[PDB]
Design an enzyme around this catalytic site. Structure first.
Site, short mmCIF file in Angstrom:
data_model
loop_
_atom_site.label_atom_id
_atom_site.label_comp_id
_atom_site.label_asym_id
_atom_site.label_seq_id
_atom_site.Cartn_x
_atom_site.Cartn_y
_atom_site.Cartn_z
CG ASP B 45 -2.33 0.72 0.86
OD1 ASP B 45 -2.28 1.73 0.97
OD2 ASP B 45 -3.31 0.03 0.57
CG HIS B 86 -5.72 3.16 1.75
ND1 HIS B 86 -5.00 2.10 0.94
CD2 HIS B 86 -6.85 3.15 1.76
CE1 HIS B 86 -6.17 1.46 0.66
NE2 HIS B 86 -7.23 2.12 0.99
CB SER B 260 -9.71 -0.02 1.38
OG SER B 260 -9.48 0.98 0.23
#
Ligand SMILES: [Ca+2]
Ligand SMILES: [Ca+2]
Ligand SMILES: [Ca+2]
Ligand SMILES: [Cl-]
Ligand code: NA
Ligand code: NA
Ligand code: NA
Lengths: 4, 473
Positions: B45, B86, B260
């Site tokens: 990520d 994230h 996600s």
């Protein structure tokens, strides 16, 4: 491209 | 007697456990003794806050790298917008530390957790390959909550290096048992995207994971397709709860959302399952997911029973993951036989599509040969076709056992005139079926427009074995  | 976590936000982690049964049954796995000890998960990520008070205790530098800046340290790049939060949010879902007075807990709260910083920059084929192929004899499970654009018009998948990384991972990774790649199926629901137009989720080498809202509905962002394997909870409307995890700047968030959040929860459950049986292969893990996932109370209008009695949906695959059932079934699991591959070139001549095309073919599935398949795993319809407006096409594939897979639904925004160039539409919905017999491919124009094109190649590719079936459900 590539997206979260 | 198992004592559940005391972390301050654990009571808000409604998707892990509860009296209500709207959960992933994770506490049941914890009570069987599985918390992730010895398993290594890496989040591919935008980085991982390795000093986060709920990650530091489980952080693993061997599971980490910074591909964007070419150094070992995956620390996120801090900005005013907190753009690079994230990966940290995804990591805490897998492996946030338990019983430490901070935030909540990971699904596998004793697993080792790393991060590959690879989204914070131009994501080339080489960047993807170096991330997918990182330390494959140390990392067990890779989690990816990213992919091609969800604009509902893109057809895009791994280029050569990334595909090579997938094959190297599943073949030689994890001591030859195969790297486990977990993928978020996508956020293109509003654009009517199809996750079969995404080569990462559509790959047989990834466990593509979709989402359900707290009340058991198909979230606004969800993409339907036949390649999805199973589901975990994520966010929904503003009356429905969301996901609790570690946030950037050493904070805790209760508002992690979207596709996600679903893949990391699946990665955590797979970590618990691998602790229960470290000898499981990459294919074993997909079998366990197929057999143990639960449709019950997930709402969809397309639930269908396949040829072996399992309910399957294009929104949910085989349904919600069930951690307690996964770890229980893993313990005495008999390794599956080596994977066979039966290639059937269907067409003898190109076929004009027009308003509707149906291609019927009776196959023997490599009868008499060492790649004879009587027990299907994945099936692909590899299609080469021209068409003037791609998103007006709907494509279905019907198995000999009568299971109708939607390979492609209409994509209103897909104006492309580029067609499909040997695109390997994949379905999981005929898993464990006998693929001998009549297959039917249907291609139709869903619009009133006078569209035109030609199907020039249809390869049916069957994967699977010839032994070990269960009595149908
Ligand atoms: Ca760095
Ligand atoms: Ca904690
Ligand atoms: Ca998509
Ligand atoms: Cl292959
Ligand atoms: Na192998
Ligand atoms: Na996949
Ligand atoms: Na048959």
């Amino acid at each position: 491209x590539x997206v979260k | 007697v198992y004592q559940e976590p005391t972390d301050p936000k654990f009571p808000q982690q409604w998707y892990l456990s509860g009296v209500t049964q709207r959960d992933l049954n994770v506490k049941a796995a914890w009570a069987q003794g599985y918390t992730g000890h010895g398993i290594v998960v890496s989040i591919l990520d935008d980085g991982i806050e390795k000093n986060h008070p709920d990650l530091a205790g489980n952080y693993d530098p061997g599971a980490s790298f910074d591909v964007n800046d070419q150094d070992p340290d995956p620390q996120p790049r801090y900005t005013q917008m907190n753009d690079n939060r994230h990966g940290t949010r995804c990591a805490g879902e897998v492996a946030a530390v338990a019983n430490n007075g901070v935030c909540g807990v990971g699904v596998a709260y004793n697993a080792r957790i790393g991060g590959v910083r690879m989204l914070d920059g131009e994501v080339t084929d080489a960047v993807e390959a170096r991330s997918l192929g990182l330390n494959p004899n140390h990392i067990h499970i890779y989690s990816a909550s990213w992919g091609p654009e969800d604009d509902g018009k893109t057809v895009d998948g791994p280029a050569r290096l990334a595909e090579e990384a997938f094959f190297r991972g599943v073949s030689q990774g994890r001591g030859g048992l195969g790297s486990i790649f977990v993928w978020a199926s996508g956020n293109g629901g509003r654009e009517h995207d199809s996750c079969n137009c995404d080569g990462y989720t559509n790959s047989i080498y990834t466990l593509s994971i979709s989402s359900a809202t707290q009340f058991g509905n198909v979230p606004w962002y969800s993409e339907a397709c036949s390649s999805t394997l199973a589901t975990t909870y994520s966010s929904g409307n503003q009356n429905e709860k969301q996901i609790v995890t570690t946030d950037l700047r050493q904070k805790c968030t209760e508002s992690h959302t979207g596709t996600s959040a679903s893949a990391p929860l699946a990665a955590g459950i797979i970590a618990l399952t691998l602790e229960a049986n470290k000898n499981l292969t990459w294919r074993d893990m997909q079998h366990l997911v197929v057999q143990t996932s639960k449709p019950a109370h997930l709402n969809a209008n397309d639930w269908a029973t396949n040829g072996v009695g399992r309910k399957v949906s294009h929104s949910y695959g085989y349904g919600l993951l069930d951690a307690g059932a996964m770890v229980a079934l893993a313990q005495n699991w008999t390794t599956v036989a080596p994977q066979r591959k039966c290639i059937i070139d269907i067409l003898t001549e190109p076929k004009d599509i027009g308003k509707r095309l149906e291609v019927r073919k009776t196959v023997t599935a490599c009868l008499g040969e060492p790649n004879h398949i009587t027990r299907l795993e994945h099936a692909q319809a590899r299609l080469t076709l021209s068409y003037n407006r791609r998103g007006d096409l709907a494509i279905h594939l019907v198995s000999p056992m009568g299971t109708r897979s939607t390979l492609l639904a209409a994509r209103p925004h897909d104006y492309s005139a580029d067609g499909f160039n040997d695109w390997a539409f994949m379905t999981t919905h005929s898993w464990d079926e006998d693929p001998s017999g009549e297959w039917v491919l249907e291609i139709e124009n869903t619009s009133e427009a006078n569209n035109y094109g030609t199907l020039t190649k249809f390869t049916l590719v069957l994967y699977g074995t010839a032994s070990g079936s269960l009595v149908p459900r």
